[PDB]
Design a protein around this ligand. Structure first.
Ligand SMILES: *[C@@H]1O[C@H](CO)[C@@H](O[C@@H]2O[C@H](CO)[C@@H](O)[C@H](O)[C@H]2NC(C)=O)[C@H](O)[C@H]1NC(C)=O
Ligand SMILES: *[C@@H]1O[C@H](CO)[C@@H](O[C@@H]2O[C@H](CO)[C@@H](O)[C@H](O)[C@H]2NC(C)=O)[C@H](O)[C@H]1NC(C)=O
Ligand SMILES: *[C@@H]1O[C@H](CO)[C@@H](O[C@@H]2O[C@H](CO)[C@@H](O)[C@H](O)[C@H]2NC(C)=O)[C@H](O)[C@H]1NC(C)=O
Ligand SMILES: *[C@@H]1O[C@H](CO)[C@@H](O[C@@H]2O[C@H](CO)[C@@H](O)[C@H](O)[C@H]2NC(C)=O)[C@H](O)[C@H]1NC(C)=O
Ligand SMILES: CCCCc1nc2c(N)nc3ccccc3c2n1Cc1ccc(CN)cc1
Ligand SMILES: CCCCc1nc2c(N)nc3ccccc3c2n1Cc1ccc(CN)cc1
Ligand SMILES: *[C@@H]1O[C@H](CO)[C@@H](O)[C@H](O)[C@H]1NC(C)=O
Ligand SMILES: *[C@@H]1O[C@H](CO)[C@@H](O)[C@H](O)[C@H]1NC(C)=O
Ligand SMILES: *[C@@H]1O[C@H](CO)[C@@H](O)[C@H](O)[C@H]1NC(C)=O
Ligand SMILES: *[C@@H]1O[C@H](CO)[C@@H](O)[C@H](O)[C@H]1NC(C)=O
Ligand SMILES: *[C@@H]1O[C@H](CO)[C@@H](O)[C@H](O)[C@H]1NC(C)=O
Ligand SMILES: *[C@@H]1O[C@H](CO)[C@@H](O)[C@H](O)[C@H]1NC(C)=O
Ligand SMILES: *[C@@H]1O[C@H](CO)[C@@H](O)[C@H](O)[C@H]1NC(C)=O
Ligand SMILES: *[C@@H]1O[C@H](CO)[C@@H](O)[C@H](O)[C@H]1NC(C)=O
Ligand SMILES: *[C@@H]1O[C@H](CO)[C@@H](O)[C@H](O)[C@H]1NC(C)=O
Ligand SMILES: *[C@@H]1O[C@H](CO)[C@@H](O)[C@H](O)[C@H]1NC(C)=O
Ligand SMILES: *[C@@H]1O[C@H](CO)[C@@H](O)[C@H](O)[C@H]1NC(C)=O
Lengths: 773, 774
RNA sequence: UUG
RNA sequence: UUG
């Protein structure tokens, strides 16, 4: 179907609308720029390779390159792989870029460069040099960058990539860059705000440096500035998970009261981890546009109960005061100044790490009339006592976050404590409505009154509490509109089949990782509790170690998805015991069933007949299946996806069309298949996806793989097999080289293991002409 | 060093004292009895193979055979592998055994036999026919067994191996087996006690059958009987995890009051799952020797509060009354009859599954003066309330088990609900510290010192798997002055205070594994230097805590010898560039054993080995995804004896292991990616004793890598499951493997050529390389 | 392989 | 692969 096989080890893509030819060679173990890159190439990406140098030969004929991404071909030692350390810094020979007349973006990050590469074309808008060893900026080296708009220089001098001196920037180095909009000098051992900066700046990133003081006029001309990040100068170092040096004398980052006067356009101000003890209202006298203010990780515990500066912030959307607690202090309660009530525009308020024992309704009163308040985050506060009914006054919020507290009767898991949460790399129930997140607390017992006045709730997260209780349907009575209950990581005791039946609008129920009572013999479990839940769509009961059930069927008219992974259906379906072979049969509208990780080394006859009639996607992954009667797939008349990955199957069916006329997606990766049957895919016409990767296949012949089926395949995975590239393989090699069908990893892992001559050689590159002499 | 390589695929052992030549061919994928079995073979085992028949050729030369274990060469379908189903039942041709004049033991279990094999020699003492399809016993077929003493016929007709009829035994079938001592007819669809049985019986196993009634004279002559098991006739089927049919009308197994009158020798009586509602004292009128009585899984809840029969059992050692609760009943308390006080010899009392809300001191008063009482088991009772101080009257006990209850302010996990807990297979803890109070798997969320008032005698406390989500500050355990072992695993400990546990001043072992909760949230203070206070602490387990951060930078101990730190994130604590935690273990001065496997250590930052404490001898870095390893750094570990690097991603071994560690004795490199050894790998490694190179990708081994003065010290050398290339370049290695005394497991099974073509799949032990010397 |  |  192709006249000329593509042999280039890079994905090539055409976006003809913007006349972009995109050539992506990311992570192809390349030691040279491959020959044959299309001459019309616009975007060329060579990240994560081991190309030791650039030269005029590199892009010689690539004259229409608008973007070169050449990052991480020599990552600095501590940042890169220790099993493949780069031996010598990337070498850029003169004239490597002067010919690239159309070049708009050049990425050279993580190449251990010692200096700003010169000879760059005047068309260049974006230059990126992060994670090199460039720690002295001189005006002379920047003249070439007249038209530059975006310049990334950070991570060139910090604990993970040290330069062992202070960063140096010459007076007015950036001033004649008259179009420069974004300047990032983060994570760099900088000691003062460089001046003067061009007044065209929109974004200035100076965080994680050694700037001890702000001069009044450091930001005098920056009347177009919209984002300023000064975080991590004089860091608060308590429990820092990276090496952290505080400013001497317990000093804060000193900012004169008028320092921001010119920043009339400022939208985002980040002062995280500057050891601040006070927030002078004078800072904000001439910024009324401010929308986002990060004051997390300072020492503003007292200031939170005063906070006059808030009166100057009527347009603020986001306010973060997390982790301002005083060391060794466990406050009784939360003192929020009344000044908070003047935050007319506030949608998002975050005060984790305030650290206090009792949350009481009136302490939140300053928030009562903030009409736009969508998120209230009081997590990681070690709150012991909170009458949940106080949130009757917060029905308008989208998320009330009390996660990780000690209550009893989405941000990344490392977020407030990571060094650079915006660092670049070399390469949930909120949607249901009002969410009360109580996850990771100490709730041991629940009763209906605990949820008094909270009938508006759509999602309740009780995951990771200590609830060890037989629910009989009486515990959630107020939660009349609840659509989503996360009850995972508790110790539910399904003694009563009336559990959860009061949650009459419940659509999704997670009772995963409630294995405690299931792992002790002789205890009653009612798995038919689903019959009462008339609108239940999705039920998760993963990792419960279920090996026994008092009831023999689960029943639902509504349930479409059942996750039953990590249980012991091998015990329930012990050969000879027929009692549970229709456990799922009366889930009449069930479409998706996950019974991976159930130790099902075989499937007793009757399991398939016992499946409910509308099953579409069935996972049997990770079972150690050593055999499989493919013919029994005939019972699964609506089966579209069959996941058999990570098992021990050695054969495929003689005729897949004779096993299922509906099957579209067959995942057989990570098995032990050594050969295909003679007529495997014969007449399997709307088969569309076939994963045979990570098996031990040596040969594939045309009878097993007729082209009338292969041409309909959205994707066909064959990588990591044991292909023998002898003359018997002539059809398969020819087809792989000329096919339109998508086959991932042809450049990297579709390989001959022999015969000797061809060992380790890619099938895409293989020349079998000697077979036709 | 051997003139004749051993090529037989079976382990051979000589026990010269007992004149035994033991040949074990268990699980060798054999389709025929291997040739070359020693002619002096006494014990021959061929279990788990697929030898389709036996014939006079089978044991032709093996005339001194005392034991043949030929089990599971054709296991019944539901019992066997579903990937390798046996196609046809084992065929035994005539006179296959009649020549084995010394044959004392014959096992033919799991072969789908239809009949009792004939022609057996009269020397036979033990015949085993479990898991076949023999379900009709006729006196004629038993004449050959004149001298038989032990006869196993069970598991021939039950749900996993059905015969679809009742078991049949001809009247007096066994009577003329005048030496018969043990008779097992369990799991067989038997409907009556076969009679008459020979009076020589010592053990009678009739459990899991369909016997609804015992005739009064069923055991009339069994005056030597010591063990009688009638369990599982009229079973109690509630929550049974196997198919279970009760006797109609909820009837119990009916036993006449005089049924046991002849059993004056009875030591063990098992009436488990017989749906009993009463235990008539008349049963035990002439059994005064009884030591073990299992009455679990009946309906004896009422009877436990009356239990007059206990007055007839002064010699009883074990009494099991577990799982007698009435269905749907949650009693307020445990009513134990005063009759319990007459169990003067009782060592072990088990009453799980009574099901009651409140345990109070006086309810155990019938037990107070049982002087020999060692074990009191009240687990799986859903007890909600118990003043632990009541056990101050029980300091003589060895184990007090309140496991799996709901208390708040060693048996197999499947045991009482298992079908046949003594079922044979085809192939074949802190109690030692002193008084143990097991509170594991309860609902304890908060502990305070007074909870343990009056229990200073305790040596071990098991709090595993509670809900304790508390900052221990040294005040919670104050009465436990003699505690040697605290299992605090699977809780939510909050190590805010470095004074946690410091009140346990005699503590030798502390398990705080799987307390990951507070370690999983950023910015929380964790004091790992809490160890300084524990002056006699030997062993610390803190596995699977997900530790990725620590406020303190060193742990300190003068006493700690073993630290388990597996399943944490030392990769994060030792991030390249961060030096603060590189001496985390350095001041554990007496530490000899460190497990830091499963810590995602894909590389080791420089400074880790220098930072190890000076006496470390046993170090595990297993299961880290280690992709590289500077072997030279082992030089810092001057007392290292065992290095476990299994299940990693290493591709090379050091050029000279002796130049890396002068102390290393045990080097575990199994399950890595090693493709070749260095030229002089083991040169002068005089302290090497154990070397596991199995499950790698080695193609070739040359003599320079494996000097013979090092190999001769090796207690063991593992090489199986590599990718050995059996060309003429491999002549040294093939010759050496064939002629070496060194122990190398799996030469018959998994030391194999992958090529060249001709030799693919062949064992190197069997490989003939003469063409390389023409 | 810029966490 | 007798649980
Ligand atoms: C291909 O490269 C071009 C050139 O850098 C990328 O286009 C730029 O995208 C950013 C995104 O906002 C714009 O600000 C620039 O102005 C764009 N430049 C041009 C010339 O249009 C494009 O995103 C890249 N695409 C791919 C798939 O790599
Ligand atoms: C950041 O710059 C400081 C200089 O202010 C570096 O500190 C010097 O480091 C050298 C070598 O380690 C010492 O000999 C000097 O005494 C240090 N000077 C001072 C004033 O401390 C520091 O190492 C740099 N940090 C990084 C990560 O590059
Ligand atoms: C070898 O076979 C003999 C005979 O079958 C075994 O001897 C029996 O051992 C059991 C258990 O150890 C004793 O209780 C019996 O009294 C012995 N029976 C006879 C008839 O002597 C012996 O154990 C076997 N040894 C090995 C290593 O397989
Ligand atoms: C145990 O024996 C009973 C009866 O002795 C068998 O039950 C009969 O089974 C046949 C075939 O399945 C049925 O048609 C009869 O109705 C049953 N009879 C009675 C009285 O129940 C039973 O199959 C046997 N069990 C096993 C495991 O072999
Ligand atoms: C964001 C807080 C980091 C420090 C910290 N860690 C913990 C912890 N692991 N457990 C606690 C348990 C209860 C109260 C406070 C803390 C606490 N705290 C706060 C705290 C620590 C110590 C003290 C002195 N009692 C008061 C408050
Ligand atoms: C060995 C016990 C098997 C049956 C069982 N299962 C459970 C269970 N999952 N949770 C309980 C929780 C409290 C009390 C009893 C049970 C119980 N029980 C006993 C029981 C169940 C139900 C009732 C009536 N509420 C009384 C007693
Ligand atoms: C909690 O507050 C609600 C009103 O918001 C009140 O009805 C209820 O009684 C309170 N409960 C407790 C224990 O204070
Ligand atoms: C509930 O909270 C936990 C955090 O502990 C989170 O992992 C989970 O995704 C949440 N559930 C939903 C439905 O968002
Ligand atoms: C369910 O249990 C709750 C809590 O103990 C109790 O208030 C209620 O009476 C019970 N409901 C039913 C229907 O048994
Ligand atoms: C669940 O099934 C059990 C069968 O053991 C029965 O006792 C109970 O009534 C059933 N309940 C529901 C809600 O289906
Ligand atoms: C205990 O139960 C027995 C038998 O049911 C009865 O005779 C006795 O009076 C009961 N005693 C107590 C204290 O409950
Ligand atoms: C528990 O019993 C002991 C007597 O052994 C007594 O000292 C203590 O007060 C009791 N505690 C409670 C809570 O009943
Ligand atoms: C404590 O009990 C747990 C839970 O039953 C058990 O796994 C553990 O091995 C016990 N610990 C000791 C030291 O015996
Ligand atoms: C430790 O905590 C316990 C329980 O909260 C308390 O009784 C005691 O005063 C505390 N002791 C110290 C030394 O902090
Ligand atoms: C443990 O180390 C911390 C240092 O962060 C110190 O504050 C504390 O007092 C130490 N405690 C002990 C018992 O060494
Ligand atoms: C080394 O320690 C491991 C546990 O970490 C133990 O299993 C092994 O037997 C020990 N080896 C020696 C030789 O002491
Ligand atoms: C390693 O070998 C070299 C050369 O034999 C020797 O100089 C050096 O001292 C040795 N080091 C150790 C630790 O044995």
């Amino acid at each position: 179907a192709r006249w000329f096989p593509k042999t280039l080890p890079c994905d090539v893509t055409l976006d003809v609308s913007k006349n972009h030819v995109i050539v992506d060679c990311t992570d192809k173990h390349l030691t040279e720029i491959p020959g044959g890159i299309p001459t019309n190439t616009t975007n060329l990406t060579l990240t994560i390779n081991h190309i030791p140098d650039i030269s005029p030969a590199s892009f010689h004929r690539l004259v229409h390159l608008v973007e070169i991404d050449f990052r991480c071909n020599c990552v600095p030692i501590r940042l890169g792989s220790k099993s493949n350390m780069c031996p010598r810094r990337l070498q850029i020979k003169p004239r490597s870029f002067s010919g690239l007349t159309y070049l708009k973006s050049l990425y050279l990050d993580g190449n251990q460069l010692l200096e700003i590469p010169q000879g760059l074309p005047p068309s260049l808008q974006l230059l990126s040099l992060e994670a090199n060893n460039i720690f002295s900026i001189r005006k002379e080296q920047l003249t070439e960058l007249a038209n530059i708009e975006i310049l990334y220089l950070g991570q060139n001098c910090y604990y993970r990539n040290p330069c062992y001196v202070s960063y140096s920037i010459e007076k007015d180095a950036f001033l004649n860059l008259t179009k420069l909009k974004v300047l990032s000098l983060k994570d760099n051992n900088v000691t003062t705000v460089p001046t003067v900066l061009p007044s065209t700046l929109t974004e200035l990133y100076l965080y994680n440096n050694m700037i001890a003081e702000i001069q009044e006029d450091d930001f005098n001309n920056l009347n177009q500035l919209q984002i300023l990040d000064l975080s991590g100068n004089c860091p608060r170092c308590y429990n820092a998970p990276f090496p952290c040096t505080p400013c001497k004398n317990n000093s804060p980052l000193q900012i004169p009261v008028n320092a921001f006067d010119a920043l009339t356009e400022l939208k985002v101000l980040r002062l995280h981890s500057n050891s601040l003890q006070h927030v002078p209202p004078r800072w904000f006298k001439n910024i009324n546009n401010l929308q986002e203010l990060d004051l997390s990780q300072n020492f503003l515990a007292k200031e939170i109960g005063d906070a006059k500066f808030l009166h100057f912030l009527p347009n603020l959307i986001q306010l973060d005061l997390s982790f301002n607690f005083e060391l060794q202090v466990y406050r009784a309660s939360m003192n929020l100044s009344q000044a908070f009530s003047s935050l007319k525009s506030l949608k998002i308020l975050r005060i984790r790490g305030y650290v206090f024992k009792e949350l009481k309704s009136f302490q939140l009163s300053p928030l009562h009339n903030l009409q736009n308040l969508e998120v209230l985050d009081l997590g990681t506060n070690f709150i012991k006592i909170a009458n949940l009914s106080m949130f009757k006054q917060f029905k308008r919020l989208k998320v009330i976050d009390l996660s990780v507290n000690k209550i009893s009767p989405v941000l990344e898991q490392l977020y407030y404590f990571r060094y650079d949460k915006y660092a670049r790399s070399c390469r949930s129930c909120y949607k249901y409505g009002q969410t009360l997140d109580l996850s990771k607390n100490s709730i041991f017992f629940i009763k209906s009154s605990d949820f008094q006045h909270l009938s508006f709730l759509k999602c309740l997260n009780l995951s990771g509490n200590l609830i060890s209780q037989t629910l009989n349907g009486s515990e959630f009575q107020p939660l009349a509109e609840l659509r989503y209950l996360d009850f995972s990581n508790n110790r539910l005791d399904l003694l009563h089949s009336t559990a959860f039946e009061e949650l009459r609008k419940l659509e999704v129920l997670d009772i995963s990782s409630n294995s405690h009572y299931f792992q002790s013999e002789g205890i009653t479990h009612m798995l038919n509790f689903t019959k009462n839940l008339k609108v239940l769509q999705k039920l998760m009961m993963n990792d419960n170690d279920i090996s026994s059930s008092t009831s023999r069927t689960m029943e639902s008219e509504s349930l479409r998805t059942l996750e039953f992974r990590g249980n012991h259906l091998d015990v329930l379906w012990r050969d000879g015991d027929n009692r549970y072979l229709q456990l799922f049969k009366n889930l009449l509208k069930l479409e998706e069933l996950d019974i991976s990780k159930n130790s099902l080394s075989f499937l007793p006859s009757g399991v398939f007949d016992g499946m409910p009639p509308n099953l579409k996607n069935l996972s049997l992954a990770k079972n150690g299946l050593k055999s499989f009667i493919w013919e029994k797939l005939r019972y699964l008349k609506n089966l579209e996806t069959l996941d058999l990955s990570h098992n021990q199957l050695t054969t495929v069916p003689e005729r897949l069309s004779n096993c299922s006329r509906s099957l579209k997606n067959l995942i057989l990766k990570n098995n032990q298949i050594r050969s295909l049957t003679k007529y495997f895919l014969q007449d399997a016409f709307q088969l569309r996806y076939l994963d045979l990767s990570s098996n031990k296949i040596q040969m594939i012949q045309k009878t097993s793989f007729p082209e009338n089926v292969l041409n309909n395949l959205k994707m066909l995975l064959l990588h990591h097999n044991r292909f023998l590239c002898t003359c018997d393989a002539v059809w398969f090699v020819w087809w792989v080289q000329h096919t339109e069908v998508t086959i991932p990893y042809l450049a990297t892992d579709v390989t001959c293991v022999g015969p000797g001559a061809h060992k380790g050689q890619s099938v895409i590159s293989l020349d079998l002409y000697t077979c036709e002499l």
